[PDB]
Protein backbone atom coordinates (compact mmCIF):
# COMPACT_ATOMS: atom_id res chain seq x y z
CA UNK A 1 0.00 0.00 0.00
CA UNK A 2 3.17 2.08 0.26
CA UNK A 3 5.02 -0.57 -1.58
CA UNK A 4 2.73 -0.53 -4.64
CA UNK A 5 2.89 3.27 -4.81
CA UNK A 6 6.65 3.02 -5.27
CA UNK A 7 6.16 0.23 -7.80
CA UNK A 8 3.44 2.09 -9.76
CA UNK A 9 5.59 5.21 -9.89
CA UNK A 10 8.72 3.33 -10.98
CA UNK A 11 6.76 1.53 -13.70
CA UNK A 12 5.31 4.84 -14.95
CA UNK A 13 8.82 6.25 -15.03
CA UNK A 14 10.19 3.30 -17.00
CA UNK A 15 7.32 3.50 -19.49
CA UNK A 16 7.49 7.25 -20.07
CA UNK A 17 11.15 8.23 -20.19
CA UNK A 18 13.09 7.08 -23.21
CA UNK A 19 16.35 7.81 -21.47
CA UNK A 20 16.95 6.61 -17.93
CA UNK A 21 19.96 6.08 -15.71
CA UNK A 22 20.56 2.39 -16.54
CA UNK A 23 20.44 3.18 -20.28
CA UNK A 24 22.67 6.27 -19.96
CA UNK A 25 25.43 4.70 -17.84
CA UNK A 26 25.74 1.82 -20.32
CA UNK A 27 26.06 4.37 -23.13
CA UNK A 28 28.46 6.77 -21.40
CA UNK A 29 31.67 5.68 -23.19
CA UNK A 30 29.55 7.49 -28.34
CA UNK A 31 30.30 10.23 -30.91
CA UNK A 32 32.13 13.08 -29.20
CA UNK A 33 31.46 16.75 -29.93
CA UNK A 34 34.49 18.63 -28.58
CA UNK A 35 35.02 21.46 -31.08
CA UNK A 36 33.45 23.34 -34.02
CA UNK A 37 34.78 20.73 -36.43
CA UNK A 38 33.27 17.73 -34.62
CA UNK A 39 30.11 19.77 -34.05
CA UNK A 40 29.46 20.14 -37.77
CA UNK A 41 30.01 16.43 -38.49
CA UNK A 42 27.53 15.81 -35.72
CA UNK A 43 25.08 17.99 -37.61
CA UNK A 44 25.44 15.83 -40.74
CA UNK A 45 23.58 13.03 -38.96
CA UNK A 46 22.57 13.59 -35.33
CA UNK A 47 20.99 17.04 -35.11
CA UNK A 48 18.60 17.68 -37.98
CA UNK A 49 16.55 20.73 -36.92
CA UNK A 50 18.44 23.90 -37.91
CA UNK A 51 19.93 22.21 -40.94
CA UNK A 52 23.43 27.79 -41.18
CA UNK A 53 23.69 30.00 -38.10
CA UNK A 54 25.96 30.86 -35.15
CA UNK A 55 27.19 27.69 -33.43
CA UNK A 56 26.03 28.82 -29.97
CA UNK A 57 22.46 29.08 -31.24
CA UNK A 58 22.51 25.76 -33.08
CA UNK A 59 23.76 24.06 -29.93
CA UNK A 60 21.14 25.37 -27.53
CA UNK A 61 18.36 25.13 -30.08
CA UNK A 62 19.20 21.44 -30.11
CA UNK A 63 19.26 21.55 -26.31
CA UNK A 64 15.90 23.29 -25.88
CA UNK A 65 14.33 20.79 -28.30
CA UNK A 66 15.43 18.03 -25.92
CA UNK A 67 13.97 19.93 -22.94
CA UNK A 68 10.65 20.21 -24.73
CA UNK A 69 10.72 16.47 -25.41
CA UNK A 70 11.34 15.92 -21.68
CA UNK A 71 8.45 18.24 -20.77
CA UNK A 72 6.23 16.10 -23.01
CA UNK A 73 7.42 12.93 -21.25
CA UNK A 74 7.02 14.46 -17.79
CA UNK A 75 3.42 15.32 -18.61
CA UNK A 76 2.65 11.69 -19.48
CA UNK A 77 4.53 10.47 -16.39
CA UNK A 78 2.54 12.81 -14.11
CA UNK A 79 -0.79 11.57 -15.49
CA UNK A 80 0.29 8.12 -14.30
CA UNK A 81 1.10 9.27 -10.74
CA UNK A 82 -1.74 7.86 -8.61
CA UNK A 83 -4.08 10.72 -7.75
CA UNK A 84 -2.68 13.34 -10.15
CA UNK A 85 -5.27 12.83 -12.91
CA UNK A 86 -8.03 13.28 -10.34
CA UNK A 87 -7.00 16.86 -9.63
CA UNK A 88 -8.80 19.80 -11.29
CA UNK A 89 -7.25 20.30 -14.73
CA UNK A 90 -5.87 23.72 -13.87
CA UNK A 91 -4.10 22.25 -10.78
CA UNK A 92 -2.52 19.57 -12.98
CA UNK A 93 -1.39 22.25 -15.40
CA UNK A 94 -0.07 24.46 -12.59
CA UNK A 95 1.91 21.62 -10.98
CA UNK A 96 3.51 20.84 -14.34
CA UNK A 97 4.28 24.46 -15.24
CA UNK A 98 6.14 25.13 -11.98
CA UNK A 99 7.61 21.63 -11.64
CA UNK A 100 8.96 20.39 -14.98
CA UNK A 101 12.32 22.16 -15.00
CA UNK A 102 13.20 21.07 -11.45
CA UNK A 103 12.56 17.53 -12.70
CA UNK A 104 14.44 18.13 -15.93
CA UNK A 105 17.64 19.18 -14.19
CA UNK A 106 17.34 16.34 -11.70
CA UNK A 107 17.07 13.82 -14.56
CA UNK A 108 19.70 15.59 -16.64
CA UNK A 109 22.24 14.38 -14.12
CA UNK A 110 21.67 10.84 -15.40
CA UNK A 111 23.14 11.65 -18.85
CA UNK A 112 26.03 13.73 -17.49
CA UNK A 113 29.43 12.70 -16.24
CA UNK A 114 32.38 14.88 -15.18
CA UNK A 115 33.44 15.19 -18.83
CA UNK A 116 30.19 15.99 -20.62
CA UNK A 117 26.65 15.00 -21.46
CA UNK A 118 24.79 12.72 -23.84
CA UNK A 119 22.81 14.42 -26.61
CA UNK A 120 20.58 13.34 -29.51
CA UNK A 121 19.09 10.30 -27.71
CA UNK A 122 22.51 9.30 -26.47
CA UNK A 123 24.14 9.00 -29.88
CA UNK A 124 26.13 12.20 -29.35
CA UNK A 125 28.33 13.33 -26.46
CA UNK A 126 29.17 16.97 -26.01
CA UNK A 127 32.06 17.70 -23.66
CA UNK A 128 31.79 20.00 -20.64
CA UNK A 129 34.96 21.86 -21.67
CA UNK A 130 33.62 22.56 -25.17
CA UNK A 131 30.49 24.17 -23.71
CA UNK A 132 32.67 26.20 -21.38
CA UNK A 133 34.55 27.62 -24.40
CA UNK A 134 31.47 28.88 -26.26
CA UNK A 135 31.10 32.66 -26.36
CA UNK A 136 29.43 34.39 -23.43
CA UNK A 137 26.69 34.08 -22.22
CA UNK A 138 26.19 30.60 -23.71
CA UNK A 139 29.22 29.18 -21.89
CA UNK A 140 27.51 29.83 -18.56
CA UNK A 141 24.28 27.95 -19.29
CA UNK A 142 25.23 24.33 -18.68
CA UNK A 143 28.04 24.73 -16.15
CA UNK A 144 25.79 25.20 -13.08
CA UNK A 145 23.83 22.12 -14.18
CA UNK A 146 27.01 20.02 -14.35
CA UNK A 147 27.87 21.35 -10.88
CA UNK A 148 24.50 20.17 -9.57
CA UNK A 149 24.75 16.86 -11.38
CA UNK A 150 28.16 15.96 -10.02
CA UNK A 151 26.92 16.30 -6.42
CA UNK A 152 23.64 14.51 -7.29
CA UNK A 153 25.33 11.61 -9.07
CA UNK A 154 27.62 11.14 -6.09
CA UNK A 155 24.51 10.08 -4.15
CA UNK A 156 24.50 7.05 -6.45
CA UNK A 157 20.72 6.76 -6.78
CA UNK A 158 19.08 4.33 -9.20
CA UNK A 159 15.94 4.81 -11.30
CA UNK A 160 13.71 3.36 -8.56
CA UNK A 161 14.95 6.19 -6.29
CA UNK A 162 14.81 8.87 -8.99
CA UNK A 163 11.25 8.02 -10.10
CA UNK A 164 9.99 8.75 -6.55
CA UNK A 165 12.09 11.91 -6.34
CA UNK A 166 10.66 13.23 -9.62
CA UNK A 167 7.08 12.42 -8.49
CA UNK A 168 7.71 14.37 -5.27
CA UNK A 169 8.96 17.38 -7.24
CA UNK A 170 5.85 17.45 -9.41
CA UNK A 171 3.31 16.84 -6.63
CA UNK A 172 4.26 19.94 -4.68
CA UNK A 173 1.70 21.79 -2.59
CA UNK A 174 3.28 25.27 -2.62
CA UNK A 175 3.17 26.16 -6.30
CA UNK A 176 1.38 29.48 -6.75
CA UNK A 177 -2.32 29.40 -7.66
CA UNK A 178 -3.43 25.90 -6.68
CA UNK A 179 -7.06 25.20 -5.88
CA UNK A 180 -6.89 21.97 -3.87
CA UNK A 181 -3.73 22.69 -1.88
CA UNK A 182 -4.86 20.41 0.95
CA UNK A 183 -5.10 17.31 -1.17
CA UNK A 184 -1.94 18.00 -3.20
CA UNK A 185 -0.04 18.34 0.11
CA UNK A 186 -1.39 14.95 1.23
CA UNK A 187 -0.29 13.41 -2.08
CA UNK A 188 3.17 14.90 -1.58
CA UNK A 189 3.30 13.72 2.03
CA UNK A 190 2.56 10.14 0.91
CA UNK A 191 5.20 10.11 -1.84
CA UNK A 192 7.88 11.63 0.42
CA UNK A 193 7.09 9.05 3.12
CA UNK A 194 7.45 6.18 0.64
CA UNK A 195 10.65 7.80 -0.65
CA UNK A 196 12.19 7.79 2.83
CA UNK A 197 11.34 4.17 3.53
CA UNK A 198 12.49 3.19 0.05
CA UNK A 199 15.85 4.89 0.55
CA UNK A 200 16.32 3.19 3.93
CA UNK A 201 15.89 -0.22 2.28
CA UNK A 202 17.75 0.47 -0.94
CA UNK A 203 20.61 2.35 0.73
CA UNK A 204 20.90 1.27 4.38
CA UNK A 205 24.59 2.27 4.32
CA UNK A 206 23.75 5.99 4.03
CA UNK A 207 21.49 7.11 6.91
CA UNK A 208 21.52 10.75 5.73
CA UNK A 209 20.53 10.02 2.11
CA UNK A 210 16.92 11.13 2.58
CA UNK A 211 17.93 14.50 4.06
CA UNK A 212 20.56 14.85 1.30
CA UNK A 213 17.81 14.42 -1.32
CA UNK A 214 15.58 16.97 0.40
CA UNK A 215 18.58 19.32 0.18
CA UNK A 216 18.76 18.60 -3.56
CA UNK A 217 15.11 19.60 -3.86
CA UNK A 218 16.01 22.97 -2.33
CA UNK A 219 19.01 23.16 -4.67
CA UNK A 220 16.89 22.51 -7.76
CA UNK A 221 14.45 25.28 -6.94
CA UNK A 222 17.41 27.70 -6.76
CA UNK A 223 18.98 26.20 -9.92
CA UNK A 224 15.75 26.76 -11.86
CA UNK A 225 15.31 30.38 -10.79
CA UNK A 226 18.91 31.20 -11.79
CA UNK A 227 18.41 29.51 -15.14
CA UNK A 228 15.31 31.60 -15.83
CA UNK A 229 17.34 34.80 -15.63
CA UNK A 230 20.28 33.62 -17.70
CA UNK A 231 17.71 32.58 -20.30
CA UNK A 232 16.11 36.03 -20.10
CA UNK A 233 19.42 37.81 -20.64
CA UNK A 234 20.23 35.75 -23.73
CA UNK A 235 16.85 36.73 -25.23
CA UNK A 236 17.74 40.38 -24.65
CA UNK A 237 21.37 40.28 -25.84
CA UNK A 238 20.82 37.75 -28.60
CA UNK A 239 18.08 37.43 -31.24
CA UNK A 240 19.96 35.94 -34.10
CA UNK A 241 18.07 33.11 -32.43
CA UNK A 242 14.64 32.31 -31.02
CA UNK A 243 13.61 30.94 -27.62
CA UNK A 244 11.06 28.12 -27.89
CA UNK A 245 7.53 29.55 -27.38
CA UNK A 246 6.74 27.04 -24.61
CA UNK A 247 9.88 27.88 -22.67
CA UNK A 248 8.98 31.53 -23.11
CA UNK A 249 5.69 31.05 -21.27
CA UNK A 250 7.14 28.79 -18.57
CA UNK A 251 10.01 31.14 -17.77
CA UNK A 252 8.00 34.39 -17.99
CA UNK A 253 7.53 36.29 -14.70
CA UNK A 254 7.51 33.08 -12.67
CA UNK A 255 11.01 33.51 -11.20
C1 LIG B 1 18.37 24.00 -20.27
C2 LIG B 1 17.91 24.74 -21.51
C3 LIG B 1 18.31 23.94 -22.73
O1 LIG B 1 18.47 26.03 -21.49
C4 LIG B 1 18.36 26.88 -22.61
C5 LIG B 1 19.31 27.87 -22.78
C6 LIG B 1 19.25 28.72 -23.88
C7 LIG B 1 18.23 28.58 -24.80
C8 LIG B 1 18.12 29.46 -26.02
C9 LIG B 1 18.32 28.89 -27.27
C10 LIG B 1 18.23 29.65 -28.43
C11 LIG B 1 17.93 31.00 -28.32
C12 LIG B 1 17.73 31.59 -27.06
C13 LIG B 1 17.43 32.96 -26.96
C14 LIG B 1 17.22 33.52 -25.72
C15 LIG B 1 17.31 32.75 -24.56
C16 LIG B 1 17.61 31.41 -24.65
C17 LIG B 1 17.82 30.83 -25.91
C18 LIG B 1 17.27 27.58 -24.64
C19 LIG B 1 17.34 26.74 -23.55
C20 LIG B 1 16.41 24.87 -21.40
O2 LIG B 1 15.92 25.88 -20.85
O3 LIG B 1 15.66 23.97 -21.86
Numbering used by the authors: 202 to 230, 238 to 259, 265 to 468
From the article:
The peroxisome proliferator-activated receptors (PPARs) are members of the II class of nuclear receptors (NRs) superfamily and play a crucial role in the regulation of metabolic homeostasis. Upon ligand activation (ligand-dependent transactivation), PPARs undergo conformational changes that provoke the displacement of co-repressors and recruitment of co-activators such as p300/CBP and p160, inducing transcription.
The two methyl groups of the ligand form vdW contacts with M355, F318, H440 and C276, in the upper part of the binding pocket. The opening of this usually inaccessible region is allowed by the ligand-induced switching of the F273 from the generally adopted extended to the folded g* conformation (χ1 = −67°). As a consequence, the aromatic moiety of the ligand occupies the position usually occupied by the aromatic ring of F273, that acts as a gate-keeper for the accommodation of rigid and bulky substituents at the carbon atom linked to the carboxylate group. In PPARα the similar, but more spherical, new region of the LBD is totally filled, by the single aromatic ring of AL29-26, that occupies the first branch, whereas the naphthalene rings fill the second branch of the cavity. The accommodation of the ligand in this new region induces a significant conformational change of the loop 11–12 that forms the edges of the pocket with H3 and H11. Consequently, the ligand provokes a rearrangement of the loop 11–12 whose new conformation, closer to H3, is strongly stabilized by a vdW interaction between A454 and the two methyls of V270, on helix 3 (3.4 and 3.6 Å). A further stabilization is achieved through vdW interactions of the methyl groups of A454 and L456 with carbon atoms of the naphthalene ring system (3.4 and 3.6 Å, respectively). Differently, the shifted position of the ligand in the PPARα new pocket, caused by the presence of the bulkier Y314 side chain with respect to PPARγ H323, allows to avoid the clash with the side chain of S280 (the equivalent of S289 in PPARγ) enabling the occupation of the larger and more spherical-shaped hydrophobic cavity without being perturbed the H-bond network of the carboxylate.
